[PDB]
Design an enzyme around this catalytic site. Sequence first.
Site, PDB file in Angstrom:
ATOM      1  N   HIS A   1       0.813  -1.209   0.000  1.00 35.16           N
ATOM      2  CA  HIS A   1       0.000   0.000   0.000  1.00 35.16           C
ATOM      3  C   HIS A   1       0.848   1.261   0.000  1.00 35.16           C
ATOM      4  O   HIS A   1       2.053   1.211   0.255  1.00 35.16           O
ATOM      5  CB  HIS A   1      -1.012   0.022   1.170  1.00 35.16           C
ATOM      6  CG  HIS A   1      -0.434   0.466   2.486  1.00 35.16           C
ATOM      7  ND1 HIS A   1       0.756  -0.004   2.987  1.00 35.16           N
ATOM      8  CD2 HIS A   1      -0.922   1.320   3.417  1.00 35.16           C
ATOM      9  CE1 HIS A   1       0.981   0.536   4.176  1.00 35.16           C
ATOM     10  NE2 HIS A   1      -0.022   1.343   4.457  1.00 35.16           N
TER      11      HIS A   1
ATOM     12  N   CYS B   1       3.850   5.506   5.382  1.00 32.19           N
ATOM     13  CA  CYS B   1       3.903   4.321   6.237  1.00 32.19           C
ATOM     14  C   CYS B   1       5.330   3.777   6.236  1.00 32.19           C
ATOM     15  O   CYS B   1       6.009   3.818   5.212  1.00 32.19           O
ATOM     16  CB  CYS B   1       2.926   3.254   5.730  1.00 32.19           C
ATOM     17  SG  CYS B   1       2.931   1.698   6.638  1.00 32.19           S
TER      18      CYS B   1
ATOM     19  N   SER C   1      -5.729   6.218   9.714  1.00 30.76           N
ATOM     20  CA  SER C   1      -4.324   6.516   9.400  1.00 30.76           C
ATOM     21  C   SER C   1      -4.165   7.583   8.318  1.00 30.76           C
ATOM     22  O   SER C   1      -3.228   8.369   8.349  1.00 30.76           O
ATOM     23  CB  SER C   1      -3.607   5.255   8.919  1.00 30.76           C
ATOM     24  OG  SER C   1      -3.465   4.312   9.952  1.00 30.76           O
TER      25      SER C   1
ATOM     26  N   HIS D   1      -5.229   5.547   1.583  1.00 30.05           N
ATOM     27  CA  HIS D   1      -4.369   4.517   1.010  1.00 30.05           C
ATOM     28  C   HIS D   1      -4.720   4.106  -0.414  1.00 30.05           C
ATOM     29  O   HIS D   1      -5.868   4.233  -0.853  1.00 30.05           O
ATOM     30  CB  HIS D   1      -4.506   3.188   1.786  1.00 30.05           C
ATOM     31  CG  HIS D   1      -4.334   3.286   3.269  1.00 30.05           C
ATOM     32  ND1 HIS D   1      -5.268   3.878   4.096  1.00 30.05           N
ATOM     33  CD2 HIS D   1      -3.376   2.786   4.081  1.00 30.05           C
ATOM     34  CE1 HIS D   1      -4.884   3.737   5.358  1.00 30.05           C
ATOM     35  NE2 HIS D   1      -3.742   3.076   5.370  1.00 30.05           N
TER      36      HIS D   1
END
EC number: 5.2.1.8
Lengths: 153, 153
Positions: free
Chosen positions: B49, B103, B144, B147
């Site tokens: 991702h 990330c 988060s 994505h």
Amino acid sequence: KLPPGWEKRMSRSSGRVYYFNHITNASQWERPSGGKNGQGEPARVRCSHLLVKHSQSRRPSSWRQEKITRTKEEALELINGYIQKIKSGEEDFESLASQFSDCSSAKARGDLGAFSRGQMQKPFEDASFALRTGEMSGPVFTDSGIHIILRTE
Amino acid sequence: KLPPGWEKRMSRSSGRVYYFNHITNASQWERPSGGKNGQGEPARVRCSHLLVKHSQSRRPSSWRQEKITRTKEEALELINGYIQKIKSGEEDFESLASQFSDCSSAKARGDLGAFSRGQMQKPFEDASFALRTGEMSGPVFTDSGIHIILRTE
């Protein structure tokens, strides 16, 4: 603009506009690019392929059948069907190659490993080197038969 | 007909018809299928991702910057740009993830390894399990950030 071999085309007797690659024979609705320059082509690539032989193949025999009797036309019919199924998302390249590829590489789900120019038949090589990573070709004609090529590296 | 979450849609104020997946947010011109039945979803998948955080991320910080100040809107702007670049063939998923993913998995070119349900944030998981092998999602929103998910296995 547009990467090597790519050109905007239209289906005959229709208003459907798409992009076609003259080297790989790939067709897609999506513009193949949105700048990078002097890039050339990769020096080495890794590809998988699905071959459908026909009566005119240099060796019309495979692990699938001792004598391939299908015509070039029927082989192309099959190749287009496989491309359609892969693009739909219904079937993946590896499973289709494992089941229907007339090449012994079917045992490795179509993987041919990495290679450079000078190893494969010219049209196969031209198509392979004109693919960007992850791209799949359209019907590629060689002396072996008709191939669908997937560039994995 | 049409696999889970898929529906034929049209762009607002336009005649452009396409296919959209309500679970993965993916959009494509191609019909997502051409029969298999009782298939359900995979029990385990492997995905990569590319995450773009924003000021509203639970933790607006990453290896890219101590404080992410971009808005949710700008983050979406970036995500759409990345999807565009990948679909054009100009840039590949792994290189873009390695460079722009907020990330830590960016270190592994975005690879998250294999996983089952119960591990990832719900929307992330729903999208991942609704992707067929090789498919890429559209913008997926979680706590988060936003994505782009690529199912590799």
